[PDB]
Structure 1
Amino acid sequence: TKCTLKSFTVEKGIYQTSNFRVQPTESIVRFPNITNLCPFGEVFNATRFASVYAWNRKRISNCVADYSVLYNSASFSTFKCYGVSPTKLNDLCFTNVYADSFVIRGDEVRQIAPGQTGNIADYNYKLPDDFTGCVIAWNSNNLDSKVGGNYNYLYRLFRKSNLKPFERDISTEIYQAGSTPCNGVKGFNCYFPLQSYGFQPTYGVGYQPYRVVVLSFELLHAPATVCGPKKSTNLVKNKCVNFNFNGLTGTGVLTESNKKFLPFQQFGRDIADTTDAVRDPQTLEILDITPCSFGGVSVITPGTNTSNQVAVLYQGVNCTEVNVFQTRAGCLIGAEHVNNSYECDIPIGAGICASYQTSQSIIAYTMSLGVENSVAYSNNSIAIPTNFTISVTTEILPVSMTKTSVDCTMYICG
């Protein structure tokens, strides 16, 4: 209370200091019951990839991998990520990953980024503006460049319209822009749809060939099938824990429930659009992710000029769930319950008030509304006053608050 109020003196009152939460006793990891190693290392050792207009894809599922060695590895000349940190990958899981791969000149590797434009991003391999993934590339001039030129890698120079995100289009139809009729052959304003990089060992370090792999991650409403190199714990129930369902993470009681998830449903949400329940991916049971069973803490005290003694109200908490008293407002601790009723000294709520009384203790009681009186009414009797008293009543009203002014430039800057 002294810290909440930033003072060493506390007057008679009730103060809203804090919030009770049942603490996470242990961490709990719930990945799917899967083994196997993901084929990323197969892709990193492939003899070649396709020409980039026909870019390869490998679907990744039912497996785990260590990513942490990869961005440390001397095997790669560039590593990047978007929507994820490479440092975090070993802690995560995904519904799928797709590894997408091709060979291009280094000056075009810049187009392998979210929402890009130019002939690779428009006419060979489009990444969306909000792409969640990583990109791995290596200079391959030692493998992919030759005297007179390695022409065996090509890219689409022209198309009639731009590709959608992950659209693959392999047909080399002639780019007739003008009146020059295509007829399966090159012409003026009717150009060849490809070009070849023709990679020569005299090329500068940007125009040289680079092998590229794009790690297209997705984590969906549908459960994980790919994970980092971390093992599951066993499950814990009906105790507060620091949970991790495929990377869905937080602090809470894994409450047993009969919440009627339809057979296809995997996660459930509170109206805040935050998770309230999950299906455990190994146990296949509907764990309600109850939070830390929270409740605001309010501190009832006479003034510190009178006593250091104090009482505590856990608002909305039941005393079985935290002398002790169950008010309707919440569990009250450190206050002596009394059957007598008095004028309300410190208000609590739901008709309860508290005070310092007899050797002193904080008592708590249902407040008294006033002295009970029965008027001696009957159909022929009247009370008439035989005398008076002239009262003087003092009524106090505020009229004018302090005329402040703040110069906004001298306050904000000075």
Structure 2
Amino acid sequence: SFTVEKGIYQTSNFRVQPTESIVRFPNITNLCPFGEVFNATRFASVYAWNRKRISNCVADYSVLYNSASFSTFKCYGVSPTKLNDLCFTNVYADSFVIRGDEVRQIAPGQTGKIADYNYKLPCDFTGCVIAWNSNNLDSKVGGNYNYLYRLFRKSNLKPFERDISTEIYQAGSTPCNGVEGFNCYFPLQSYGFQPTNGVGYQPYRVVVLSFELLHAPATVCGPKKSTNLVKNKCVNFNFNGLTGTGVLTESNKKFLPFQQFGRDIADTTDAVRDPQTLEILDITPCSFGGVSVITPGTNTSNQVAVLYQDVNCTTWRVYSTGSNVFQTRAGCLIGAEHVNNSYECDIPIGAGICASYQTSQSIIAYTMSLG
């Protein structure tokens, strides 16, 4: 409404806006082994897939734009656009080669021979799946029979499980006794990759990057440039990809070596280990304290007093100090003139303090008379 009746109204708590932004990422300069992971002359078979650990590097991933071109690039648990702003805790690249028709099977909650017997993904899977055609590398005239896949298995694989055994699969009821024959098949079969081959039955190189976010220390970071650390000021911070706003202060907490963030009963981040200098900083919101507006009718006047509860007025956390700053027991009242007299309550401030609009004309605050 455009008119406010006489009284005291609760407004939003006192707000402080961030003065500046800071980014604090771990101090590391090496580029991640994109050449070794993607530009590899020899990929692994899907049944025996190659897991490589990536650590202590920067995930710039703009160097792949010059040469690489990926048929599929699907990220789960994270947006593609935020990858430049994040740090990744423990990063594993799972590399293999499969058929072009089977790239759809490299995804959470899939079925098929690849998803069941060769390579299974969880659904609590934060990561990305990258696949690109390699018909000009992994296929040769007459057939490339070097890439194998498991065609028979007694049960589906668990997520991120590997099975490199070559025991004869007993499809039938009779024992196989470790020799092929009727209803006794060799579990692994080789892909036939040729250059004159259908696109669905052509080789595809697949890399699955699995990682976690914002729970543990990170040694793999995006290309964001770090910034100096400023304390005792409400600022926007980006600690290992964890964004936020607040005041950073020195902390007495002693994190264990395996801990990066501290959390409170509300699961919000209360403390953080600074990645550059191994020190603990407490994070505190910079908005705090209640504010009330005491007004007569807007028709009567546009003058208003502001009661900032829980601030001492005897640099203050007020919108405008102005004049007539009086420390009541209910907070600091600004814009009202204190008078030694006492009358009946008109606008109850609280704690035995009331206010009124009196005669030139201004808002007065006084101690209410009991009788």
Structure 2 length-normalised TM? 0.91
Structure 1 residues 16 and 285: CA distance shift in structure 2, 3 A? same
Structure 1 residues 221 and 174: CA distance shift in structure 2, 3 A? same
SS in 1 for 2:137: helix
| Kept in 1: contact 2:217–2:258 (CA 8 A) | no
Q: Distance in 2 between matches of 1:191 and 1:357?
A: 101
Structure 1 residues 130 and 317: CA distance shift in structure 2, 3 A? farther
For residues 262-314 of structure 1, the C-alpha deviation after alignment (integer angstroms, 9 at most, x for no partner) is: 56543222321111111212222221110123233321101112111111123
| Kept in 1: contact 2:217–2:259 (CA 8 A) | no
Q: Distance in 2 between matches of 1:41 and 1:318?
A: 62
Gaps of 5+ in 1: 1-6, 370-413
Q: Distance in 1 between matches of 2:325 and 2:138?
A: 80
Structure 1 residues 227 and 320: CA distance shift in structure 2, 3 A? farther
Matched residue, 1:8: 2
Q: Distance in 2 between matches of 1:129 and 1:73?
A: 31
Q: Distance in 2 between matches of 1:106 and 1:223?
A: 37
Shift in Å at residue 241 of structure 1? Answer: 0.3
Q: Distance in 1 between matches of 2:95 and 2:132?
A: 12
Matched residue, 2:37: 43
Farther off after superposition, 252-261 or 100-109: 252-261
| Kept in 2: contact 1:52–1:124 (CA 8 A) | yes
| Kept in 2: contact 1:13–1:302 (CA 8 A) | yes
SS in 2 for 1:121: helix
| Kept in 2: contact 1:259–1:286 (CA 8 A) | yes
Structure 1 residues 52 and 302: CA distance shift in structure 2, 3 A? same
Structure 1 residues 222 and 177: CA distance shift in structure 2, 3 A? same
For residues 166-194 of structure 1, the C-alpha deviation after alignment (integer angstroms, 9 at most, x for no partner) is: 11221112111322322333233322211
Gaps of 5+ in 2: 316-323
Q: Distance in 2 between matches of 1:358 and 1:72?
A: 78
SS in 2 for 1:300: strand
For residues 237-275 of structure 1, the C-alpha deviation after alignment (integer angstroms, 9 at most, x for no partner) is: 000000111011111111223245456543222321111
SS in 2 for 1:100: strand
For residues 83-105 of structure 1, the C-alpha deviation after alignment (integer angstroms, 9 at most, x for no partner) is: 11222111110112111100100
Q: Distance in 1 between matches of 2:362 and 2:204?
A: 80
Structure 1 residues 254 and 356: CA distance shift in structure 2, 3 A? same
Q: Distance in 2 between matches of 1:227 and 1:324?
A: 50
Matched residue, 1:231: 225
SS in 2 for 1:54: coil
Structure of higher RCO (CA pairs closer than 8 Å, 6+ residues apart): 2
For residues 377-410 of structure 1, the C-alpha deviation after alignment (integer angstroms, 9 at most, x for no partner) is: xxxxxxxxxxxxxxxxxxxxxxxxxxxxxxxxxx
| Kept in 2: contact 1:116–1:129 (CA 8 A) | no
Structure 1 residues 140 and 26: CA distance shift in structure 2, 3 A? same
For residues 64-121 of structure 1, the C-alpha deviation after alignment (integer angstroms, 9 at most, x for no partner) is: 0213454786532222111112221111101121111001001111011122222212
For residues 306-343 of structure 1, the C-alpha deviation after alignment (integer angstroms, 9 at most, x for no partner) is: 1111111233344486x223334433221223333322
Q: Distance in 1 between matches of 2:59 and 2:255?
A: 31
SS in 2 for 1:70: helix
Q: Distance in 2 between matches of 1:67 and 1:367?
A: 70
Shift in Å at residue 15 of structure 1? Answer: 2.1
SS in 2 for 1:206: helix
| Kept in 1: contact 2:356–2:364 (CA 8 A) | yes
For residues 357-390 of structure 1, the C-alpha deviation after alignment (integer angstroms, 9 at most, x for no partner) is: 2312212223223xxxxxxxxxxxxxxxxxxxxx
- Alpha-carbon RMSD across the aligned residues, in angstroms, is 3.7
Shift in Å at residue 197 of structure 1? Answer: 1.5
Q: Distance in 2 between matches of 1:368 and 1:157?
A: 92
Q: Distance in 1 between matches of 2:20 and 2:247?
A: 11
Q: Distance in 2 between matches of 1:337 and 1:106?
A: 82
Q: How many residues align?
A: 363
Q: Distance in 2 between matches of 1:196 and 1:25?
A: 62
